[PDB]
Amino acid sequence: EKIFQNVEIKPFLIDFSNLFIKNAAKKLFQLEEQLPLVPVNVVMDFKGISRAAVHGLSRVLQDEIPNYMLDIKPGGYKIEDSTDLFMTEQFIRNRINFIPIYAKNETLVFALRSLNNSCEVKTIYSRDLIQVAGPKLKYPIFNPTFEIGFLQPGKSLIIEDIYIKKGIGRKHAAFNLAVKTHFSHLDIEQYPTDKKEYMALSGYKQSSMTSDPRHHRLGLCFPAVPLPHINQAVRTYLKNACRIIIGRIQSIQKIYENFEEPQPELVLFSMDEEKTKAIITIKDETHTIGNLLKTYIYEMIPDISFVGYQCVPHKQEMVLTIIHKASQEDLITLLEKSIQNIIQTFQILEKNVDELIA
Amino acid sequence: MLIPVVCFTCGFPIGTYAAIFDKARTEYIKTKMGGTLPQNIPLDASLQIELKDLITALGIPMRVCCRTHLITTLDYRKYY
Amino acid sequence: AVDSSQKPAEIEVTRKDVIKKIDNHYALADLRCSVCHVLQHEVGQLNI
Amino acid sequence: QTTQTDPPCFANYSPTDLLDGKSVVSMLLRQTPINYQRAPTWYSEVYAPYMHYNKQDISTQIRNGELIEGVLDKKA
Numbered sequence: 351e352k353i354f355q356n357v358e359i360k361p362f363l364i365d366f367s368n369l370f371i372k373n374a375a376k377k378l379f380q381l382e383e384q385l386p387l388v389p390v391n392v393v394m395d396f397k398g399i400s401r402a403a404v405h406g407l408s409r410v411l412q413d414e415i416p417n418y419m420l421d422i423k424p425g426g427y428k429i430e431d432s433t434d435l436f437m438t439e440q441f442i443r444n445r446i447n448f449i450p451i452y453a454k455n456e457t458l459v460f461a462l463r464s465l466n467n468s469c470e471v472k473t474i475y476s477r478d479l480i481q482v483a484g485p486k487l488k489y490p491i492f493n494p495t496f497e498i499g500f501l502q503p504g505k506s507l508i509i510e511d512i513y514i515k516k517g518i519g520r521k522h523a524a525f526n527l528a529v530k531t532h533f534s535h536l537d538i539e540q541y542p543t544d545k546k547e548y549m550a551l552s553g554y555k556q557s558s559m560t561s562d563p564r565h566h567r568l569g570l571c572f573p574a575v576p577l578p579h580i581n582q583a584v585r586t587y588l589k590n591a592c593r594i595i596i597g598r599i600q601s602i603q604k605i606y607e608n609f610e611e612p613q614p615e616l617v618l619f620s621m622d623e624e625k626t627k628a629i630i631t632i633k634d635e636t637h638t639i640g641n642l643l644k645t646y647i648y649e650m651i652p653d654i655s656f657v658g659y660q661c662v663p664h665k666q667e668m669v670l671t672i673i674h675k676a677s678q679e680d681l682i683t684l685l686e687k688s689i690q691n692i693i694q695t696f697q698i699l700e701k702n703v704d705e706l707i708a
Numbered sequence: 709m710l711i712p713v714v715c716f717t718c719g720f721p722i723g724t725y726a727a728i729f730d731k732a733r734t735e736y737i738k739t740k741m742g743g744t745l746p747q748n749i750p751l752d753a754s755l756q757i758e759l760k761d762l763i764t765a766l767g768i769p770m771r772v773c774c775r776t777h778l779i780t781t782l783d784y785r786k787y788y
Numbered sequence: 789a790v791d792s793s794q795k796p797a798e799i800e801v802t803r804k805d806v807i808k809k810i811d812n813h814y815a816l817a818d819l820r821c822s823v824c825h826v827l828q829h830e831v832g833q834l835n836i
Numbered sequence: 837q838t839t840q841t842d843p844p845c846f847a848n849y850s851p852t853d854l855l856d857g858k859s860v861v862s863m864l865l866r867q868t869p870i871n872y873q874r875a876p877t878w879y880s881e882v883y884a885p886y887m888h889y890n891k892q893d894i895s896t897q898i899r900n901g902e903l904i905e906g907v908l909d910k911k912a
């Protein structure tokens with residue numbers, strides 16, 4: 351079974367055919383080739399898979415995958431030694447935070463030491479970042495061309511503790527990994543939207559309220575992957591995303607298989623005409639897990655009385671409400687079958703990633 | 709005060725290509741200008757400067773957000 | 789009538805009766821004057 | 837999903853069954869059945885000569901919480 355079909359990988363390369371680009375790169379950066387890290391575009395085709403799973407993969411890769419940041423340890427910004435009056439700690443910390451790094455080791459600590467010994471407004475570049483910690487870098491984790499803040503004449507800026515911080519892009523956007531570049535359903539017909547009569551419509555020949563697309567094309571772009579390890583970086587990202595989704599679904603399964611000991615996350619009621627209502631609450635869960643659970647439960651129980659979730663922006667939680675004409679044990683076992691179905695399809699996706707990209 | 713490290717909207721790292729883009733844009737403006745002072749460039753009625761091909765050669769995709777925040781962000785070193 | 793088979797073809801109506809009488813199989817042509825019975829796009833036929 | 841009420845029973849609908857908008861509005865309004873019969877603001881005589889009003893939208897009718905006619909807009 352091949353859920354994940356062929357995948358196109360295309361790094362974003364600098365076109366030195368333009369005279370201006372070549373002249374500028376060689377004039378300031380002495381750059382004659384592509385950068386050590388390039389932003390790669392990955393376009394993927396999926397078949398026989400629900401929209402919920404593809405969109406969950408997309409969302410996880412976007413922000414919910416644990417990613418690394420460059421950050422400044424408190425006290426790293428030397429107030430005494432930093433002479434420049436315009437380069438506040440906030441501005442430089444914001445500039446350094448959003449440098450997309452491809453870090454394999456978490457102990458690399460960088461330092462900034464830039465003294466403007468001249469009368470010109472010296473510009474600090476990413477090559478000014480000096481690494482003193484951990485194993486010596488045989489390959490840079492960021493491009494040496496990033497513009498950190500400049501310096502006025504005679505001014506100095508010293509930052510001594512720049513480390514690698516782990517996080518997920520949901521809490522802080524500097525951990526965002528992938529940026530979307532495409533998403534389209536390949537089984538739904540599309541209008542010629544260039545015409546006047548169809549310009550105001552989405553283009554798909556079916557309504558969203560009735561469509562159930564099963565063949566998608568998800569295009570993502572990764573901000574910085576090493577130039578000679580593009581495929582391996584992309585595979586690591588995709589396998590990690592599948593692993594995260596499997597882990598979160600299994601975390602939900604952990605409370606699912608505990609239908610006694612009324613933990614304050616699962617509450618089951620039998621009400622009215624022998625109907626069972628199941629409410630699941632997870633704090634700090636998102637539309638990914640909620641939509642996946644809803645879609646696969648509705649697949650497993652097509653004649654369900656009601657399955658629905660809500661991730662209210664406040665209360666920061668997912669509340670999944672399932673009502674079915676079955677006993678509590680029957681409903682629990684059906685929902686466990688749905689969870690195992692989710693796990694199975696994501697294991698299939700990981701295996702197909704390994705088979706395809708390699 | 710500088711071109712952002714990443715596009716605000718989406719997060720694509722335009723900051724990599726920024727420092728190259730400032731100089732390349734300056735050089736391209738030099739050729740496309742004429743008998744017009746620098747402070748009168750945004751006033752010329754017979755002047756058209758398209759940076760589409762330049763940014764494309766920089767490798768930045770056909771994204772509205774990234775190109776907007778690349779070509780529009782003000783540089784503090786230019787005014788102060 | 790847009791189609792050539794809808795036999796009523798031409799219907800002249802008042803604004804209130806439009807919803808009672810006209811349906812989707814019809815399209816609107818020029819208006820008609822209710823005093824001199826001239827078409828809106830036939831005003832140029834009048835002598836200045 | 838997000839009405840905070842007690843969600844109704846959809847056990848009688850096949851996964852390919854197509855529910856009308858008036859249907860779901862009625863499944864909400866049945867909890868407080870009322871009678872309502874009035875033209876909607878969507879229907880205006882000034883517009884009427886242009887654009888073809890759907891005859892099923894220019895009259896709103898509710899019988900005991902069963903919205904079966906018209907649209908719901910500012911008037912309703």
Ligand SMILES: [Zn+2]
Binds near residue numbers: 715
């Ligand atoms: Zn962007």
